Design a protein around this ligand. Sequence first.
Ligand SMILES: *[C@@H]1O[C@H](CO)[C@@H](O[C@@H]2O[C@H](CO)[C@@H](O[C@@H]3O[C@H](CO[C@H]4O[C@H](CO[C@H]5O[C@H](CO)[C@@H](O)[C@H](O)[C@@H]5O)[C@@H](O)[C@H](O[C@H]5O[C@H](CO)[C@@H](O)[C@H](O)[C@@H]5O[C@H]5O[C@H](CO)[C@@H](O)[C@H](O)[C@@H]5O)[C@@H]4O)[C@@H](O)[C@H](O[C@H]4O[C@H](CO)[C@@H](O)[C@H](O)[C@@H]4O[C@H]4O[C@H](CO)[C@@H](O)[C@H](O)[C@@H]4O[C@H]4O[C@H](CO)[C@@H](O)[C@H](O)[C@@H]4O)[C@@H]3O)[C@H](O)[C@H]2NC(C)=O)[C@H](O)[C@H]1NC(C)=O
Ligand SMILES: *[C@@H]1O[C@H](CO)[C@@H](O[C@@H]2O[C@H](CO)[C@@H](O[C@@H]3O[C@H](CO)[C@@H](O)[C@H](O[C@H]4O[C@H](CO)[C@@H](O)[C@H](O)[C@@H]4O[C@H]4O[C@H](CO)[C@@H](O)[C@H](O)[C@@H]4O[C@H]4O[C@H](CO)[C@@H](O)[C@H](O)[C@@H]4O)[C@@H]3O)[C@H](O)[C@H]2NC(C)=O)[C@H](O)[C@H]1NC(C)=O
Ligand SMILES: *[C@@H]1O[C@H](CO)[C@@H](O[C@@H]2O[C@H](CO)[C@@H](O[C@@H]3O[C@H](CO[C@H]4O[C@H](CO)[C@@H](O)[C@H](O)[C@@H]4O)[C@@H](O)[C@H](O[C@H]4O[C@H](CO)[C@@H](O)[C@H](O)[C@@H]4O)[C@@H]3O)[C@H](O)[C@H]2NC(C)=O)[C@H](O)[C@H]1NC(C)=O
Ligand SMILES: *[C@@H]1O[C@H](CO)[C@@H](O[C@@H]2O[C@H](CO)[C@@H](O)[C@H](O)[C@H]2NC(C)=O)[C@H](O)[C@H]1NC(C)=O
Ligand SMILES: *[C@@H]1O[C@H](CO)[C@@H](O[C@@H]2O[C@H](CO)[C@@H](O)[C@H](O)[C@H]2NC(C)=O)[C@H](O)[C@H]1NC(C)=O
Ligand code: NAG
Ligand code: NAG
Ligand code: NAG
Ligand code: NAG
Ligand code: NAG
Ligand code: NAG
Ligand code: NAG
Ligand code: NAG
Lengths: 97, 127, 119, 130, 49, 88, 106
Amino acid sequence: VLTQSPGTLSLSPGETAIISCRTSQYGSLAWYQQRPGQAPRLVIYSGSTRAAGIPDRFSGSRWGPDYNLTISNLESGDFGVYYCQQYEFFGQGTKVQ
Amino acid sequence: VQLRESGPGLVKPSETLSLSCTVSNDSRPSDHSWTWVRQSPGKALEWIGDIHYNGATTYNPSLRSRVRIELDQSIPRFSLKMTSMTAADTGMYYCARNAIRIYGVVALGEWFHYGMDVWGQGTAVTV
Amino acid sequence: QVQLVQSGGQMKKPGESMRISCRASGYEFIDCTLNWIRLAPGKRPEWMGWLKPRGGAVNYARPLQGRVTMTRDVYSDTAFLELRSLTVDDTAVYFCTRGKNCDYNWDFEHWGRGTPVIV
Amino acid sequence: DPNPQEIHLENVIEEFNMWKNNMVEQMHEDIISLWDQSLKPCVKLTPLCVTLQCTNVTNNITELKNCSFNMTTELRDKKQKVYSLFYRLDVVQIKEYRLINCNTSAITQACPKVSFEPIPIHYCAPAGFA
Amino acid sequence: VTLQCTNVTNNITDDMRGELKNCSFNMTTELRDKKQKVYSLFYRLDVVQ
Amino acid sequence: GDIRQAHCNVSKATWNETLGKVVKQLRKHFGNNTIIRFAQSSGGDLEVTTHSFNCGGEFFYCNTSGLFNSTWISNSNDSITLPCRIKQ
Amino acid sequence: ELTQPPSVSVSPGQTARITCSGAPLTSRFTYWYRQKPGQAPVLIISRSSQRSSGWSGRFSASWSGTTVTLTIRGVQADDEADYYCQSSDTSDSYKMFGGGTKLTVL
Ligand SMILES: *[C@@H]1O[C@H](CO)[C@@H](O[C@@H]2O[C@H](CO)[C@@H](O[C@@H]3O[C@H](CO[C@H]4O[C@H](CO[C@H]5O[C@H](CO)[C@@H](O)[C@H](O)[C@@H]5O)[C@@H](O)[C@H](O[C@H]5O[C@H](CO)[C@@H](O)[C@H](O)[C@@H]5O[C@H]5O[C@H](CO)[C@@H](O)[C@H](O)[C@@H]5O)[C@@H]4O)[C@@H](O)[C@H](O[C@H]4O[C@H](CO)[C@@H](O)[C@H](O)[C@@H]4O[C@H]4O[C@H](CO)[C@@H](O)[C@H](O)[C@@H]4O[C@H]4O[C@H](CO)[C@@H](O)[C@H](O)[C@@H]4O)[C@@H]3O)[C@H](O)[C@H]2NC(C)=O)[C@H](O)[C@H]1NC(C)=O
Ligand SMILES: *[C@@H]1O[C@H](CO)[C@@H](O[C@@H]2O[C@H](CO)[C@@H](O[C@@H]3O[C@H](CO)[C@@H](O)[C@H](O[C@H]4O[C@H](CO)[C@@H](O)[C@H](O)[C@@H]4O[C@H]4O[C@H](CO)[C@@H](O)[C@H](O)[C@@H]4O[C@H]4O[C@H](CO)[C@@H](O)[C@H](O)[C@@H]4O)[C@@H]3O)[C@H](O)[C@H]2NC(C)=O)[C@H](O)[C@H]1NC(C)=O
Ligand SMILES: *[C@@H]1O[C@H](CO)[C@@H](O[C@@H]2O[C@H](CO)[C@@H](O[C@@H]3O[C@H](CO[C@H]4O[C@H](CO)[C@@H](O)[C@H](O)[C@@H]4O)[C@@H](O)[C@H](O[C@H]4O[C@H](CO)[C@@H](O)[C@H](O)[C@@H]4O)[C@@H]3O)[C@H](O)[C@H]2NC(C)=O)[C@H](O)[C@H]1NC(C)=O
Ligand SMILES: *[C@@H]1O[C@H](CO)[C@@H](O[C@@H]2O[C@H](CO)[C@@H](O)[C@H](O)[C@H]2NC(C)=O)[C@H](O)[C@H]1NC(C)=O
Ligand SMILES: *[C@@H]1O[C@H](CO)[C@@H](O[C@@H]2O[C@H](CO)[C@@H](O)[C@H](O)[C@H]2NC(C)=O)[C@H](O)[C@H]1NC(C)=O
Ligand SMILES: *[C@@H]1O[C@H](CO)[C@@H](O)[C@H](O)[C@H]1NC(C)=O
Ligand SMILES: *[C@@H]1O[C@H](CO)[C@@H](O)[C@H](O)[C@H]1NC(C)=O
Ligand SMILES: *[C@@H]1O[C@H](CO)[C@@H](O)[C@H](O)[C@H]1NC(C)=O
Ligand SMILES: *[C@@H]1O[C@H](CO)[C@@H](O)[C@H](O)[C@H]1NC(C)=O
Ligand SMILES: *[C@@H]1O[C@H](CO)[C@@H](O)[C@H](O)[C@H]1NC(C)=O
Ligand SMILES: *[C@@H]1O[C@H](CO)[C@@H](O)[C@H](O)[C@H]1NC(C)=O
Ligand SMILES: *[C@@H]1O[C@H](CO)[C@@H](O)[C@H](O)[C@H]1NC(C)=O
Ligand SMILES: *[C@@H]1O[C@H](CO)[C@@H](O)[C@H](O)[C@H]1NC(C)=O
């Protein structure tokens, strides 16, 4: 039903990472970040709206079935595994190190 | 109500012995559990089994494997077949009616037994 | 302020049952839906079910139906996730989660600490 | 008194949304308020939270619990033994039982003379609205 | 209700500080018939002989 | 008199027809090749696991598992009796 | 499975107490039959209502714990017979019959 294309992105600090996502049904896609050890935290909701307290580097969406998260200026608080979300459906999630 | 019971009477060991019971002058036979009982000479009554018009049937454990009941409902004919009978399994056999009272909705299990009020005179069977 | 507090560290064998509590505080406990998420390395996140702790209404996920029960104590403000016939593939970390607002349920903003379960 | 003053609006297309209709919340609030208002002026059944000695009603040979208890009466210094029948859903163990909600809340008896039959109620918009 | 109060337990004759008093009483419970003895430290300004 | 269970009847044929209509209207939304199944309420308090009546001044909580159940494949004087528990 | 005395002896003016005990009797009703040699059993005591009430003036019974006692007053010589207790199990799958108590008249 839902999937994420990139498996793992071995990027250095300061580089911009792209994480694509494909949904076969209409739904409000949301993006979550899971750091090592910490619980997940909401990053994007309703497709592209930014959650409160999230830095401005996070954005990215499209009208079509394909969405993608842009994450520029990778820093220590970045990295971990990023998950897609639909109405109770989740993707594999892409790990950024 | 009259329960006229009949059968071969004399059978050899290790084949099937069959009994029949005709129900006469009962209005609405479908509301009662039709039962078979046996009694060896000098021993207590032994319950064989019973059957209801809805298809539910029941037996005595450790004997149920050798026994089976039929009940033709078009003409209320009440039949028993008991296989693998031994020489010691003799005595009197009686067909009987366990009348059932309904006091509420039968679908909810709201009934009870009035006991085996009507009995047939039975048949003495030697094996 | 919204806070969800769990108790974890359970160590179980195959076939045993488990119960995880989730105390909610800050928001009115009886006016917002809770959800139970399962996370693990390798396999995808899995949704366990949602609980509406006013009428106690529950919805379970299809793979878990018949194995997972949810309860709510409205006087302790505590949800409970009970799982039966726990097996090796259920080794995972369990979250008690709440949406960003009480109108749309799937914007999981408020997550608990996490409940490791090692089978 | 009057007939329904229904005026058709030819060639008007209006966007409806039931799931954000405030009429629903207003009805819910009003109905709860009427419920509380009707329940308020009658018995409070605070004395009824007592230890009940309850047995099965049985079939006389071997859903409902036949409960007995020492209740208060008109006079403060007198008590009376009361036998009653409760449903098993209303009664919880502490044989000795109690009522289900006596450790949680005070149960207010529904006033004997008020009937719970629903009656039609119309909601009318105030002047300046429609 | 009538409280039987004692000075707070210093374990010896040491002076009680804040004038806390042990102040047991009988009290009620959810069931009307039963009663539950309760021990509760009350400040001396709150309690009168 | 005798102690008997409070119960509620719904016509079986009418209810089956109603579920057929509802299944058609749901298949209009989910697809014409799907399987639509019904089941009893999966949990909660007595108010949500049962159907609540407040009639005649008395409150009933009826087990609706008889009305639901059965599966619909894409392709009478017979009543469904629901036990009802009363709560004061 | 269903235990009752082998026999009891009573005078014409005495009341016989034919006891019958068993685990399934703690929850189920008991039906009492009388049998004479050759003749089929006839129903004596049964269940005519959910909540029991009075019965015939003779052949009464009383329940206690797991044991039910058949009280028969006004016993005469014609009552010499084998009395049987019958009862369903706790699951209502099968019926139990007693070993029979031979009531004799002194
Ligand atoms: C939802 O839909 C469901 C269905 O899906 C529906 O469920 C239905 O509910 C009703 C509720 O009323 C339920 O009816 C019960 O039926 C019981 C048995 O039926 C007897 O009556 C019918 C019809 O009666 C006709 O005649 C009446 C005469 O007054 C009249 O009032 C009626 O309107 C009607 O015209 C009858 O057909 C039966 O036939 C047997 O008996 C006849 C007697 O002559 C005989 O001709 C027949 O052949 C047949 O007899 C056979 O079996 C006997 C066994 O002994 C044999 O001897 C014969 O040879 C035959 O083989 C029945 O007579 C009945 O028990 C219920 O009535 C009880 O409850 C009411 C409460 O008001 C009492 O007033 C009654 O007295 C009675 O209670 C007595 O009996 C019960 C059980 O015996 C005891 O527990 C009670 O304590 C009490 O006993 C007292 O008296 C007796 C002596 O009578 C005494 O011995 C005791 O010691 C004690 O003193 C009741 O009518 C119906 O079955 C049910 N349907 C199904 C399919 O289950 C729901 O209602 C629906 N819900 C909604 C909301 O819509
Ligand atoms: C959802 O839908 C599905 C179908 O899509 C439903 O499954 C169906 O469930 C039916 C029951 O609800 C079931 O019918 C049963 O089938 C068998 C056929 O062999 C039979 O056991 C059942 O009949 C017994 O049980 C009913 C229950 O009330 C009794 O009314 C009936 O008399 C039978 O009980 C008697 O016989 C049993 C053994 O034969 C005894 O254990 C029992 O104690 C009782 O005793 C009789 O004899 C005694 C003499 O000793 C006497 O005292 C007593 O009075 C009795 O005469 C019943 O017909 C369907 O087969 C099944 N269908 C499928 C396709 O699986 C499912 O339930 C639905 N779910 C819900 C939640 O509603
Ligand atoms: C459940 O709730 C969700 C939101 O939470 C709703 O999802 C929205 O659904 C609506 C339709 O009901 C969507 O709107 C439509 O989106 C399409 C976007 O298409 C893109 O991709 C294609 C490539 O396949 C491109 O061709 C296209 O340019 C876009 O890039 C369009 O197909 C639709 O536009 C058409 O209709 C509009 C109607 O006004 C016209 O103006 C256009 O010209 C064109 O004909 C339309 O915009 C919307 O995007 C969804 N939003 C989400 C997922 O956030 C679900 O509908 C709702 N479900 C139910 C059952 O209520
Ligand atoms: C509930 O219990 C009471 C107390 O046992 C029952 O009333 C008594 O019934 C006995 C006979 O069983 C009488 O001898 C007593 O005099 C009755 N007591 C009183 C105070 O009236 C009562 O019948 C029971 N209720 C039910 C429905 O079984
Ligand atoms: C009444 O509803 C209850 C649930 O509220 C049903 O109980 C379950 O029924 C299923 C199907 O028969 C059984 O597999 C479960 O074991 C039952 N649960 C428990 C806890 O025992 C019940 O069957 C319903 N009654 C009827 C007559 O349909
Ligand atoms: C059937 O029995 C009834 C009494 O129940 C009696 O009046 C009738 O004559 C009998 N009929 C036959 C054919 O024996
Ligand atoms: C009442 O019936 C229940 C049925 O489960 C039984 O456990 C209980 O012991 C009964 N109580 C009495 C007092 O007989
Ligand atoms: C219970 O049975 C006895 C006889 O054993 C009878 O006298 C008594 O009235 C019955 N009780 C009720 C409440 O019907
Ligand atoms: C009522 O009080 C008396 C006081 O002697 C006591 O014996 C009795 O058990 C009490 N009854 C109940 C039902 O608690
Ligand atoms: C009241 O008692 C019940 C008994 O089951 C218990 O579950 C419940 O928690 C109690 N209520 C409160 C508010 O503690
Ligand atoms: C408690 O202490 C006071 C001094 O504050 C002293 O006078 C009094 O006797 C003491 N009372 C008891 C009961 O020890
Ligand atoms: C509490 O009540 C009991 C009842 O026996 C009484 O004897 C006792 O003195 C009371 N205790 C206190 C501390 O007042
Ligand atoms: C009660 O409902 C049943 C459902 O089958 C129906 O047949 C019957 O006519 C109804 N009775 C009344 C009086 O409406």
